[PDB]
Amino acid sequence: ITSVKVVTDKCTYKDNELLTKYSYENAVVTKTASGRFDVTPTVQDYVFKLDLKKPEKLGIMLIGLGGNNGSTLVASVLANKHNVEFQTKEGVKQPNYFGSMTQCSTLKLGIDAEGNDVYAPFNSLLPMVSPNDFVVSGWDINNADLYEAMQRSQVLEYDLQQRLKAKMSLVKPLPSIYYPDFIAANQDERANNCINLDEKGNVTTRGKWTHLQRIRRDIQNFKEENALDKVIVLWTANTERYVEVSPGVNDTMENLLQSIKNDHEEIAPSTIFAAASILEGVPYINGSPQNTFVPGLVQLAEHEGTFIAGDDLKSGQTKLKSVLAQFLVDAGIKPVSIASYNHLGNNDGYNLSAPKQFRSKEISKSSVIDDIIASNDILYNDKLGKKVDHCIVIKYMKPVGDSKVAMDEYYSELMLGGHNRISIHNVCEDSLLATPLIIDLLVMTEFCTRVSYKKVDPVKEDAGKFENFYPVLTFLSYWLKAPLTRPGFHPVNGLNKQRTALENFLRLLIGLPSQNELRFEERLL
Amino acid sequence: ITSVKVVTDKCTYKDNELLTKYSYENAVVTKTASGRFDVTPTVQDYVFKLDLKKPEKLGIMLIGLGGNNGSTLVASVLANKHNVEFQTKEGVKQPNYFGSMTQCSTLKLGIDAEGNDVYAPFNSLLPMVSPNDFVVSGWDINNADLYEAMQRSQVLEYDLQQRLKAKMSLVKPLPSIYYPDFIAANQDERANNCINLDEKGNVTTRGKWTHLQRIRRDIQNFKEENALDKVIVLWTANTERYVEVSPGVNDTMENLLQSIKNDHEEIAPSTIFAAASILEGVPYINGSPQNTFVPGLVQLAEHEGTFIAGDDLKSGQTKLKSVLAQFLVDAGIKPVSIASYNHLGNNDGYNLSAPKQFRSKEISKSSVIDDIIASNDILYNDKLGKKVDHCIVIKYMKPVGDSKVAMDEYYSELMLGGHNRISIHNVCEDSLLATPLIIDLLVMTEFCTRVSYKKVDPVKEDAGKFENFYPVLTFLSYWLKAPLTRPGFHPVNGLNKQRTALENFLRLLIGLPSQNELRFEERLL
Amino acid sequence: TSVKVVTDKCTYKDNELLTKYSYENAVVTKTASGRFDVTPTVQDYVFKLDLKKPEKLGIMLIGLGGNNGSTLVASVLANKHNVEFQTKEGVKQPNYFGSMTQCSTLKLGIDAEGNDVYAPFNSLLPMVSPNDFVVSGWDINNADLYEAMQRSQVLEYDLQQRLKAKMSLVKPLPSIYYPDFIAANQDERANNCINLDEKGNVTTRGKWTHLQRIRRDIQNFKEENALDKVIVLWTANTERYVEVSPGVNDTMENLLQSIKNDHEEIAPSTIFAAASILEGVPYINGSPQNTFVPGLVQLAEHEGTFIAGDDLKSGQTKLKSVLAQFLVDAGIKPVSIASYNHLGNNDGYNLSAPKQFRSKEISKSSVIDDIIASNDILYNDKLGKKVDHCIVIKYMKPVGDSKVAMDEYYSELMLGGHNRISIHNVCEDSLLATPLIIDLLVMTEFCTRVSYKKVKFENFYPVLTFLSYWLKAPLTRPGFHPVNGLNKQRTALENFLRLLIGLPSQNELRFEERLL
Ligand SMILES: NC(=O)C1=CN([C@@H]2O[C@H](COP(=O)(O)OP(=O)(O)OC[C@@H]3O[C@H](n4cnc5c(N)ncnc54)[C@H](O)[C@@H]3O)[C@@H](O)[C@H]2O)C=CC1
Ligand SMILES: NC(=O)C1=CN([C@@H]2O[C@H](COP(=O)(O)OP(=O)(O)OC[C@H]3O[C@@H](n4cnc5c(N)ncnc54)[C@H](O)[C@@H]3O)[C@@H](O)[C@H]2O)C=CC1
Ligand SMILES: NC(=O)C1=CN([C@@H]2O[C@H](COP(=O)(O)OP(=O)(O)OC[C@H]3O[C@@H](n4cnc5c(N)ncnc54)[C@H](O)[C@@H]3O)[C@@H](O)[C@H]2O)C=CC1
Ligand SMILES: O=P(O)(O)/C=C/[C@@H](O)[C@@H](O)[C@H](O)CCO
Ligand SMILES: O=P(O)(O)/C=C/[C@@H](O)[C@@H](O)[C@H](O)CCO
Ligand SMILES: [Mn+2]
Ligand SMILES: [Mn+2]
């Protein structure tokens, strides 16, 4: 087993709880008309409390359980949990969670006697739940069991699917909420496991509040049937179209709940699942690009004090773009044109073949570089131009299956008329990439539910009571394309910066300062 | 000077005319229900007559003279004609016609004493007009002179544009026909050199027959002002939308001419230019993808006996695709997915940014592989599947200017589950590629106008009188995406096969048989 | 599916086909003034094709246990026995995709509408099918072909398992291992050798005895399976070129003498070729080494045996000649062509050594020189007649048999412009090489049943240059420079099959449409 023991007086343990002192420093800046930056440092002391008693089993309810991601996730959990080795043309392979930052990445704890960097597993600093301990279920408008789902998805090695056949076959998605207008028309035939059916047994968008009540009961039922204490809900179903946000409809906690009861046409299935999970006090993670978290819902989460988070998985082309575009601008290079083409032949691409669904994705896959452009007015300004041409294209090409092909070109300006042209061709099993990210989101969300804190008054000992994270868990931004933010704050998409936040967080809970990379043990005599 | 002298009794010269005997062989095939192919060879003897008196100057009237292709063509002609060397970062460069199959490709005439292949310039077999002898003019809805056109286009080296400044500045496009509905709305501001203006001086699609009469007079005027004997019209203006072909409108020579007089809404500017050139007996070449040659026009060409030809320039991505896809299928490999993405930032891409214009291009850029799939039912059939997923994408990205970036992926099947994935990134100055192809089309069209023939009756000497090529010059298919064909016949897009046709044609006029590649001087003792 | 041409150029005489053919061409000379004098030439011929093809064709592969050898056997068994297999994309049916003789078609003529009619490449004249191949061969490693398959990691696991029972039965015969002719690492792999001394050790002494043993292996294979026709093909690791010296291997008599003299320039492939020639069986060299030294070519001529080869024209080199040719035919001037490649199979491992790779760097390069030379408008002393070119092959084990090829064509356009085409080609190398081997065997067998006479029948000059479509280093007749234009190379084959059934070469003139 891997564990870390930090010798610090900032940390004490009391009844399965770790208490850690932390002085958070930042700075408020102002810019003079002239052009001077006045920086006022700041400080706020805290005491973080970490419940060390992690759950032995964590309930996981996926919406879209029968899809590529859904079936692959269950498969990865079963395969790893039971060490289901499988045959391939490269020979027997041992199951693993490669692609999981939470399960397969490491972090620098410090330097050793010789002065060489020492790294430890990301999940070895503080107690985290293992995906091998996930008890998974969920919903799907299609009733195929999970073995059929695997076959249909064509993601996993034939031999592996066969070894998981027996178990996967017994896993059946619960009927779900199907409202025809929110997803592509071509998914119509797929919908045969719906709870919203009229007297004639047909699909009906009538009775949206009864649906909400069923989903909540589904969560309660699942939990007790498994003797679980905690459950997390994650949406990994078809990308819906955006819903119109309007006053009196979904702008407030009150208008939203009412619109739901009135069956407003701008209440999507995700709106119902989110509202249900929130009302049950269950973390809800949105893995798709639609704007499920309209003002009224966020408001409901804040009021209920329930974790919400998400907006599309940042797994391939966009993940790398949030690394490459950052890199270029940090180097003083000016990207002026970024073309991103994509084609896949799975159900994800089949649904996204329709404009209303594609537009959702198109928006989240573009937003990722906006903050980058904004951070540098030396390169991007009115005099030199502050725009970067950016196009996102997603075409459905059945023959490539789940292996999305991403082709991008970054055309940038260098000094004295020069240019830099970086062409990319990125191929990979989209689900094998996404699945571990879904695992990361659940692992980190669960970790977050066991964290609380309280401001420390310098001139008054033991003031304030512990609070929980502000409802919107921005700490999970690393795994999302369009980071949901707190009202007023702008999102930051820099991948490396998003991971650093997670790193320093774990580091501070065990009493370590943030990474500085100064290495004065070397640079100074 | 380069010239070829073939010792053959099949060729005689009489008063600046070459007379050549040729026995054309082919074969008619039938397929038995059982599955046998009955092949009946055929033969038809001919006597081809080639007018050797090529014109000293060839009139060239481009529609879209002020565009990227138009200005570049005039520039290339001026630069080469006057040996205008220019400065670059790689040093002084000498003008040339690289990219011109007609000016820079060679053909194998035979083998030498040692048995080694001997090649001669494509234009050295028989007298052809030099582009240095082109007298160019034309029309454009924009009045900018050709120097401004060059600056605006940003295709040529700054130093070269400057050396051509004086001459190019004096070249001004003639006002043209602007009908707002046929091209992108964004070209509206560009239109300020129109002949179709009402009393108020505004653009009017009224009086389409007067426009036709003006264009014809334009051709007559241009010709006499330059003391020219021959002129060729070539459309290199914005891609128009397709026009609806309907009975009583543009299905016959008669309905078309009437619709023109009635100002039918399905009579585009290209329809007018084509009709005008045909009525003037001037070859008309369509360098864009719109369906300018509706049944009624082709009928008018046949009746007038005037050369027509075209439908989009096959210059880059599509040219290479007509080589690569052919190659794969000839090798028994089965392409199943071909994704073609493209982005450019010139006016061509700005206009194509609108769906109605893009659809025209999209159709011609796809058609190129249909004949290939059809030729092999071993690979493409009902049992194995006879479809090849193919998508064409064109995005406008201003920062790349005239340097179109073409990205394609050919995903094919190999035996026993294998696949082959060929990714491509093709960059180039689109106009530097297209321009020489426009030059080729004009050079070959002019050559064709000096060719006639007559069937030879074996049992009756001197029967029949000379005829000219069937109106639709399919021999130019090498330079076009969607080869216009004779009613009933299907087009062949194989690039290498298209060039071979041109090669064997020139070869037969000087008394040589088609290339067989048997080399029995080597393979046999 | 069959073809029946109504022509008076072909007469059948009991499994015999006689076809008349006038071969036209032309001889050219150039005047100082720059005038080309062309004199047409014609030579009449009569071809005879023995229509009686073998019902079973013996195939002996040197390197039978490698990627190509094992995949070849698997494809034959899989197709022959319709072994469908499971994949994550579902059940797939076996086929010979990638094979020109089995999966490409040819245009026979036009229909009543004026549109092209195509027929299977192997449907014009009787050709042996790969399903009727009886395969055996040698290998320095004794692993059975099932183990060979697993080792190769070329085929779908389920297909390997469905073929396990049959493939296990196939084991390679011991072979000749002369250490110095290949990459060191191919050492402890050599556990199956006939060349051993009275101590049991691998030796290069007694080369004539080795030769005699290969002939016996060939005779036994024939008798053992009651086969009349057998073809041998080298698909074993690339050897290091041998030096051709006078009296050593410059002639038929010297060559044989040097073999008996255990001469150091007598390579294992040299012996398999000599043995095959003596047994009268066609020998195909699927590797870059210069197996066919002068003395060896004389032996082939003398025995009237067909030889052919010098490296299996791989996909890249194949597509590279096509693109380069295409550019130059369009009047575009490539000025730089860079080729980088990496694979992780034994082939790549063996080529990781300079002497093995060097052989391959010689063949794949010469192809663009033909192109440069074909156009003095673009390539001349005034504008420059050179084209920078580089071929790099690195061993990257992890990519296994899936060779990755990365090329970049940089060309000049008019008035200072440029065209940059960069490619990234990936594929299971052996899934492309296997079918190419099937084509070579099928076409070599066909050529052996063809004889001709100008105007007693004679045979196809030892070197079957007709197979250049599948070989990177086209072996040619003395004095003649090899041609590599893939499309031209396929044209030759197409027209050959056409002339045998009385059809002229394709002209693409389509006068039924172009003329009134
Ligand atoms: N596989 C491909 O795509 C291409 C292969 N080639 C040629 O074919 C050869 C084989 O290719 P692969 O099957 O991929 O390689 P491989 O490495 O799997 O096959 C060679 C292995 O070495 C053994 N071997 C070495 N020396 C031998 C000898 N003296 N007698 C008998 N067996 C011997 C066997 O041939 C064994 O299978 C290469 O070395 C090369 O010359 C050429 C172009 C492409
Ligand atoms: N696949 C990837 O790598 C990534 C996936 N995502 C997103 O995750 C989602 C799922 O992706 P995949 O698994 O590939 O797609 P998928 O189409 O295979 O799976 C989605 C599943 O959701 C079900 N479904 C649709 N609407 C539903 C509803 N209202 N209630 C319950 N079930 C419903 C469908 O029947 C289907 O089985 C999509 O929105 C996709 O864009 C985002 C980034 C990356
Ligand atoms: N540029 C290339 O490499 C190739 C070009 N083509 C086609 O050739 C055409 C021209 O291309 P570019 O020169 O790049 O575009 P461009 O936009 O620069 O030039 C076209 C010119 O035509 C003029 N024009 C538009 N409608 C007109 C009308 N009714 N009458 C007269 N003038 C009119 C415009 O004012 C403009 O100056 C387009 O349809 C393009 O798609 C096709 C294949 C390749
Ligand atoms: O590879 P990315 O840009 O990080 C993620 C991309 C995802 O949106 C895609 O897989 C999407 O679901 C399919 C269409 O491309
Ligand atoms: O490069 P291609 O496919 O041969 C020709 C492509 C031409 O249609 C393009 O330049 C088109 O005008 C612009 C949009 O791509
Ligand atoms: Mn997926
Ligand atoms: Mn252009």
Residue A8 one-letter amino acid: T
The DSSP secondary-structure symbol of C468 reads: G
Q: Write the CB contacts of B217 (distance below 8 Å, at least 6 apart in sequence).
A: none
Q: Apex CA B345: angle with CA B344 and CA B346, to 5°?
A: 105
Residue C91 one-letter amino acid: V
Q: Which residues of A touch C400 (CB under 8 A)?
A: 90
Q: In whole angstroms, what is the distance from residue C384 CA to residue C376 CA?
A: 10
B86 at the C interface (CB within 8 A)? yes
Contact by Cβ (8 Å): A79, A155: no
Q: Are strands C105-110 and C333-343 parallel, antiparallel or unpaired?
A: unpaired
* Interchain proximity A89–C156, CB inside 8 Å: yes
Q: Write the CB contacts of A276 (distance below 8 Å, at least 6 apart in sequence).
A: A212, A215, A216, A219
Ligand nearest to the CA of A288: 2
Residue C361 one-letter amino acid: E
Q: In whole angstroms, what is the distance from residue B174 CA to residue B62 CA?
A: 10
Chains in touch with A (3+ beta-carbon pairs under 8 Å) read: B, C
Which tokens sit at A223?
Answer: 């939990």
Q: Write the CB contacts of C199 (distance below 8 Å, at least 6 apart in sequence).
A: none
Q: A86: nearest CA in chain C?
A: C157
**Please, which residues bridge with residue B236 across strands?**
none
Q: Nearest C-alpha of chain B: how many angstroms from C499?
A: 10
Q: A156: nearest CA in chain C?
A: C88
Active-site residue (options: B140, B312, B402, B440): B312
CA of C180 to the centre of ligand 2 (A): 59
In sequence order, what DSSP letters do the residues of C159-198 get, joined into one string? Answer: HHHHHHHHHHT--PBPB---GGGS-TTSSTT---BS-B-T
User: Quick check: helix, strand or coil at residue A387?
Assistant: coil
Ligand nearest to the CA of A269: 2
Q: Write the CB contacts of A232 (distance below 8 Å, at least 6 apart in sequence).
A: A58, A59, A60, A61, A282, A283, A284, A285, A442, A445, A446
B88 at the A interface (CB within 8 A)? no
Q: In whole angstroms, what is the distance from residue A352 CA to residue A346 CA?
A: 10
Q: Which residues of A touch C155 (CB under 8 A)?
A: 89
User: Quick check: helix, strand or coil at residue B461?
Assistant: coil
Q: In whole angstroms, what is the distance from residue B511 CA to residue A60 CA?
A: 81
Q: Apex CA C399: angle with CA A437 and CA A321, to 5°?
A: 40
Residue B491 one-letter amino acid: P
Closest to C94 in 3D by CA, of C103, C441, B376, C2: C103
- Ordered by where they begin, the domains of chain B are 1-314+430-525 (3.40.50.720), 315-429 (3.30.360.10)
* Interchain proximity A407–B341, CB inside 8 Å: yes
Instruction: Report the greatest alpha carbon distance in chain A.
Output: 83
Contact by Cβ (8 Å): C54, C133: no
Contact by Cβ (8 Å): B294, B251: yes
Ligand nearest to the CA of A404: 4
Alpha-carbon B257 to chain mean position: 26
Chosen from C71, C157, C426, C427 to mutate, greatest number of chain A CBs within 10 A: C157
The DSSP secondary-structure symbol of C321 reads: H
Which tokens sit at B452?
Answer: 């006639």
Closest to B523 in 3D by CA, of C464, C131, A472: C464
N- to C-terminal Cα separation, chain B: 38
Chosen from A68, A89, A163 to mutate, greatest number of chain C CBs within 10 A: A89
Closest to C502 in 3D by CA, of C124, C102, C115, C128: C124
- The atom of ligand 5 lying closest to the CA of B239 is 12
Contact by Cβ (8 Å): B312, B289: yes
CA distances from A471 to A46, A278, A446, C149 (A): 19, 10, 13, 56
Q: In whole angstroms, what is the distance from residue C103 CA to residue B376 CA?
A: 8
Contact by Cβ (8 Å): B509, B125: yes
Which residue in the block uniquely carries the two structure tokens 């798709």? A288
Q: In whole angstroms, what is the distance from residue B234 CA to residue B283 CA?
A: 8
Q: In whole angstroms, what is the distance from residue A156 CA to residue B267 CA?
A: 56
In sequence order, what DSSP letters do the residues of C395-439 get, joined into one string? Answer: E-GGGTTEEEEEEEEEEE-GGG-EEEEEEEEEEEHHHHHHHHHHH
Burial class (CB in 10 A: 0-12, 13-18, 19+), B374: middle
Would you please indicate which residues of A are annotated as catalytic (active-site) residues?
Answer: 312, 361, 404, 481
* Interchain proximity A425–B411, CB inside 8 Å: no
Sheet with C333-343: list strands edge to edge.
B389-396, B334-344, B403-413, B419-429, C418-428, C402-412, C333-343, C388-395
Mutation choice for ligand 2 from A194, A348, A350, A426, CB with most ligand atoms inside 8 A = A348
Q: Write the CB contacts of B342 (distance below 8 Å, at least 6 apart in sequence).
A: B317, B392, B393, B394, B395, B404, B405, B406, B407
* Interchain proximity B486–C155, CB inside 8 Å: no
Contact by Cβ (8 Å): B186, B166: no
**Please, which residues bridge with residue A457 across strands?**
A460
Q: Are strands B117-121 and B106-111 parallel, antiparallel or unpaired?
A: antiparallel
CA distances from C454 to B472, B512, C48, C460 (A): 44, 22, 12, 13
- The atom of ligand 2 lying closest to the CA of A288 is 39
CA of A82 to the centre of ligand 6 (A): 24
Dihedral over Cα of C460, C465, C469, C471: its sign: positive
The DSSP secondary-structure symbol of C250 reads: S
The DSSP secondary-structure symbol of B133 reads: G
Q: Nearest C-alpha of chain B: how many angstroms from C246?
A: 25
Helix C157-168 and helix C67-80: axis angle, to 10°?
A: 90
Which tokens sit at C441?
Answer: 């065997």
B82 at the C interface (CB within 8 A)? no
Secondary structure of A291-348 as H, E, C letters: CCCCHHHHHHHHHHCCCEEECCECCCHHHHHHHHHHHHHHCCCEEEEEEEEEEECCHH
Name the strand (E) or helix (H) holding A70: helix A68-81
Which tokens sit at C323?
Answer: 């693109």
Which tokens sit at A179?
Answer: 């409202």
Q: Are strands B308-310 and B284-286 parallel, antiparallel or unpaired?
A: parallel
Q: Apex CA C208: angle with CA C206 and CA C214, to 5°?
A: 110
**Method by which this entry was solved:** X-ray
Closest to B193 in 3D by CA, of B179, B175, B210: B175
Q: Apex CA A302: angle with CA A298 and CA A308, to 5°?
A: 55
Q: Nearest C-alpha of chain B: how many angstroms from C217?
A: 31
Burial class (CB in 10 A: 0-12, 13-18, 19+), C52: exposed
Facing B411 at nearest CB: one of A336, A341, A400: A400
CA distances from C275 to C134, C204, C211, C286, C441 (A): 20, 17, 6, 17, 18
Chosen from C97, C410, C421, C468 to mutate, greatest number of chain B CBs within 10 A: C97
Q: Apex CA C276: angle with CA C274 and CA C277, to 5°?
A: 65
Q: In whole angstroms, what is the distance from residue B288 CA to residue B278 CA?
A: 18
Alpha-carbon A242 to chain mean position: 19
Q: Apex CA B132: angle with CA B129 and CA B138, to 5°?
A: 90
Helix A495-509 and helix A317-330: axis angle, to 10°?
A: 90
Secondary structure of B32-99 as H, E, C letters: CCCCEEEEEEEEEEEEEEEECCCCCCEEEEEECCCCHHHHHHHHHHHHHHCCCCECCCCCCECCCCCC
In sequence order, what DSSP letters do the residues of B395-414 get, joined into one string? Answer: EE-GGGTTEEEEEEEEEEE-
Q: What are phi and psi of A490, to 5 degrees?
A: -95, 145
Q: In whole angstroms, what is the distance from residue A345 CA to residue A398 CA?
A: 4
Residue A264 one-letter amino acid: H
- The atom of ligand 1 lying closest to the CA of C71 is 13
> Is any ligand 3 atom within 6 A of the Cβ of residue B364?
no
* Interchain proximity C90–A154, CB inside 8 Å: yes
Burial class (CB in 10 A: 0-12, 13-18, 19+), A130: middle
Would you please indicate which residues of C are annotated as catalytic (active-site) residues?
Answer: 311, 360, 403, 472
Residue C301: count of CB within 10 angstroms of its CB = 17
Closest to B390 in 3D by CA, of B414, B409, B371: B409
Contact by Cβ (8 Å): B466, B14: no
Q: In whole angstroms, what is the distance from residue A417 CA to residue A34 CA?
A: 31
Q: In whole angstroms, what is the distance from residue A84 CA to residue C81 CA?
A: 33
Contact by Cβ (8 Å): A498, A470: no
Q: A398: nearest CA in chain C?
A: C89
Closest to B235 in 3D by CA, of B159, B143, B310, B329: B310
Mutation choice for ligand 4 from A238, A290, A322, A342, CB with most ligand atoms inside 8 A = A342
Residue A211: count of CB within 10 angstroms of its CB = 26
Ligand nearest to the CA of B237: 3
Q: What are phi and psi of C344, to 5 degrees?
A: -125, 20
The DSSP secondary-structure symbol of B186 reads: G
CA of A171 to the centre of ligand 4 (A): 27
Q: A157: nearest CA in chain C?
A: C88
> Is any ligand 2 atom within 6 A of the Cβ of residue A364?
no
Q: Where are the alpha helices (DSSP H) in B170-266?
A: 208-225, 253-261
Mutation choice for ligand 3 from B238, B286, B398, CB with most ligand atoms inside 8 A = B238
Phi-psi region of A160 (alpha: psi -120 to 50; beta: other; left: phi over 0): alpha
Which tokens sit at B380?
Answer: 């493409």
Which tokens sit at C156?
Answer: 């779908």
Chosen from B317, B350, B386, B423 to mutate, greatest number of chain A CBs within 10 A: B423
Residue B401: count of CB within 10 angstroms of its CB = 18
* Interchain proximity B427–C419, CB inside 8 Å: yes
Contact by Cβ (8 Å): A439, A476: no
Resolution of the experimental model in angstroms, please?
2.0
CA distances from A274 to A212, A257, A297 (A): 9, 12, 8
> Is any ligand 3 atom within 6 A of the Cβ of residue B403?
no
Count Cβ neighbours within 10 Å for each residue of C230-268 and write b for 16 or more, e otherwise.
bbbbbbbbbbbbbeeeeebbbbbebbbbbbeebbebbbb
Rounded to a whole number of angstroms, the CA Rg of chain C reads 24
Q: In whole angstroms, what is the distance from residue A483 CA to residue A325 CA?
A: 17
Residue C207: count of CB within 10 angstroms of its CB = 24
Q: In whole angstroms, what is the distance from residue B109 CA to residue B506 CA?
A: 11
Dihedral over Cα of B152, B158, B162, B163: its sign: negative
Which tokens sit at B442?
Answer: 């004009």
Which tokens sit at A488?
Answer: 């007023």
Count Cβ neighbours within 10 Å for each residue of A43-55 and write b for 16 or more, e otherwise.
eeebbbbbbeebb
Q: Nearest C-alpha of chain A: how many angstroms from C386?
A: 27
**Please, which residues bridge with residue A428 across strands?**
A404
Closest to A78 in 3D by CA, of A132, A37, A22: A132
Closest to B338 in 3D by CA, of B315, B312, B372, B310: B372
Cα pseudo-dihedral B159, B162, B167, B172, rounded to 10: 110
* Interchain proximity C330–B105, CB inside 8 Å: yes
Contact by Cβ (8 Å): B501, C508: yes
Count Cβ neighbours within 10 Å for each residue of A232-267 and write b for 16 or more, e otherwise.
bbbbbbbbbbbbeeeeebbbbbebbbbbbeeebebb
Q: In whole angstroms, what is the distance from residue B76 CA to residue B99 CA?
A: 12
Q: In whole angstroms, what is the distance from residue B482 CA to residue B194 CA?
A: 29
Chains in touch with C (3+ beta-carbon pairs under 8 Å) read: A, B
Q: Which residues of A touch C150 (CB under 8 A)?
A: 91
Name the strand (E) or helix (H) holding C92: strand C90-92
Q: In whole angstroms, what is the distance from residue B68 CA to residue C220 CA?
A: 73
Mutation choice for ligand 1 from C142, C285, C347, CB with most ligand atoms inside 8 A = C347
Count Cβ neighbours within 10 Å for each residue of C330-352 and write b for 16 or more, e otherwise.
bbbbbbbbebebbbbbbbbbbbb
Which residue in the block uniquely carries the two structure tokens 């002339």? C499
Which residue in the block uniquely carries the two structure tokens 């001087």? B521
> Is any ligand 2 atom within 6 A of the Cβ of residue A237?
yes
Which tokens sit at A381?
Answer: 């300004």
Residue C30: count of CB within 10 angstroms of its CB = 15
Q: What are phi and psi of B56, to 5 degrees?
A: -70, -25
CA distances from A304 to A280, A282, B388 (A): 9, 10, 53
Contact by Cβ (8 Å): B41, C6: yes
Q: What are phi and psi of B241, to 5 degrees?
A: -80, 165
Q: In whole angstroms, what is the distance from residue C106 CA to residue C409 CA?
A: 31
Q: A399: nearest CA in chain C?
A: C89
Q: A409: nearest CA in chain B?
A: B405
Which residue in the block uniquely carries the two structure tokens 């955006």? A242
CA distances from B180 to A56, B191, B216, B237, B359 (A): 70, 9, 22, 14, 17
Q: Nearest C-alpha of chain B: how many angstroms from A391?
A: 8
Q: In whole angstroms, what is the distance from residue A118 CA to residue A121 CA?
A: 11
Closest to A121 in 3D by CA, of A97, A103, A95: A103
